[PDB]
Amino acid sequence: IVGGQEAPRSKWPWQVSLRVHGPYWMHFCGGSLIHPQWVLTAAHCVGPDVKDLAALRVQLREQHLYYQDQLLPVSRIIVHPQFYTAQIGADIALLELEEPVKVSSHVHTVTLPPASETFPPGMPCWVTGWGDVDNDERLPPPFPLKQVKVPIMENHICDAKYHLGAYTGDDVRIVRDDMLCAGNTRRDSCQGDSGGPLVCKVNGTWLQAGVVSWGEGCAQPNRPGIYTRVTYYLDWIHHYVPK
Numbered sequence: 522i523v524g525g526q527e528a529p530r531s532k533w534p535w536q537v538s539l540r541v542h543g544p545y546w547m548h549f550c551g552g553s554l555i556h557p558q559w560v561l562t563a564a565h566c567v568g569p570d571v572k573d574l575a576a577l578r579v580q581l582r583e584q585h586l587y588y589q590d591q592l593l594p595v596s597r598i599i600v601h602p603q604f605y606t607a608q609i610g611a612d613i614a615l616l617e618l619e620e621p622v623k624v625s626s627h628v629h630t631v632t633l634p635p636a637s638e639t640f641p642p643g644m645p646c647w648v649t650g651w652g653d654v655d656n657d658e659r660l661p662p663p664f665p666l667k668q669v670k671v672p673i674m675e676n677h678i679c680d681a682k683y684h685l686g687a688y689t690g691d692d693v694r695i696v697r698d699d700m701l702c703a704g705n706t707r708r709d710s711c712q713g714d715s716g717g718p719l720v721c722k723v724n725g726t727w728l729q730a731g732v733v734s735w736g737e738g739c740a741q742p743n744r745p746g747i748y749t750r751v752t753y754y755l756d757w758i759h760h761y762v763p764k
């Protein structure tokens with residue numbers, strides 16, 4: 522997370538950290554709890570190639586990475602079958618946990634948007650995670666969960682911005698219809714936040730609008746952050762995750 526601030530303990534109780542086995546169980550991507558056995562994340566965090574499940578674990582909401590880890594194993598990685606790269610799209614995946622988690626005020630699910638919600642500009646939305654605090658700047662220890670309020674840009678503004686300073690033909694779409702843009706040069710996600718949630722408050726409920734997907738660097742001029750658009754993938758999600 523670039524810009525913004527350390528998150529409060531009572532906020533983002535759905536935030537998840539994904540961990541890869543090595544010298545230590547290292548954070549590489551975010552996720553969100555959308556059901557007691559289901560984490561929603563980005564496909565590029567776990568694919569496109571098939572990983573060893575035993576090398577992957579999940580950590581539920583933690584104010585600081587590593588200090589009070591209670592890792593949780595994973596029984597299934599479902600990755601969207603359209604997925605090959607983030608730039609093409611369908612950068613969305615699901616993790617099933619070996620057990621259902623227990624829900625509380627500290628730790629509970631996020632609500633998915635109804636298919637009609639467009640998330641127009643001037644909606645207040647926050648993105649969260651333990652990723653880099655700028656281009657090539659690691660989040661320093663003690664690795665607090667960060668948040669930043671990001672302005673949503675309409676898809677067509679954002680596509681056009683990605684064409685400024687580019688050779689790519691204006692008619693050749695870069696920001697796709699299954700994607701969502703937010704951020705500016707002060708406020709953005711970065712590496713390490715991929716797979717975590719962009720959430721927007723609507724009628725006093727938090728809805729996850731996006732999954733942190735990609736961008737040309739972080740908080741770079743004319744390069745807003747790009748997120749997978751959750752509305753686009755509800756039917757796919759619901760094929761696996763009960764209502």
Ligand SMILES: NCc1cccc(C2CCN(C(=O)c3cccc(-c4cccc([B@@-]5(O)Oc6ccc(C(=O)N7CCC(c8cccc(CN)c8)CC7)cc6O5)c4)c3)CC2)c1
Pocket residue numbers: 606608709710711712713714715733734735736737738739740745746747
């Ligand atoms: N601010 C929002 C935000 C949120 C989260 C994360 C980000 C980051 C996204 C990635 N970043 C980019 O700037 C970026 C931007 C655009 C495109 C890319 C990108 C472009 C093309 C490919 C990829 B890649 O992710 O997709 C890949 C597919 C394959 C490979 C690979 O295996 N190699 C590359 C090709 C190499 C190669 C070269 C020559 C010949 C061969 C054949 N033997 C093979 C071999 C290694 C490597 C790959 O990298 C990424 C990266 C940094 C910031 C941003």
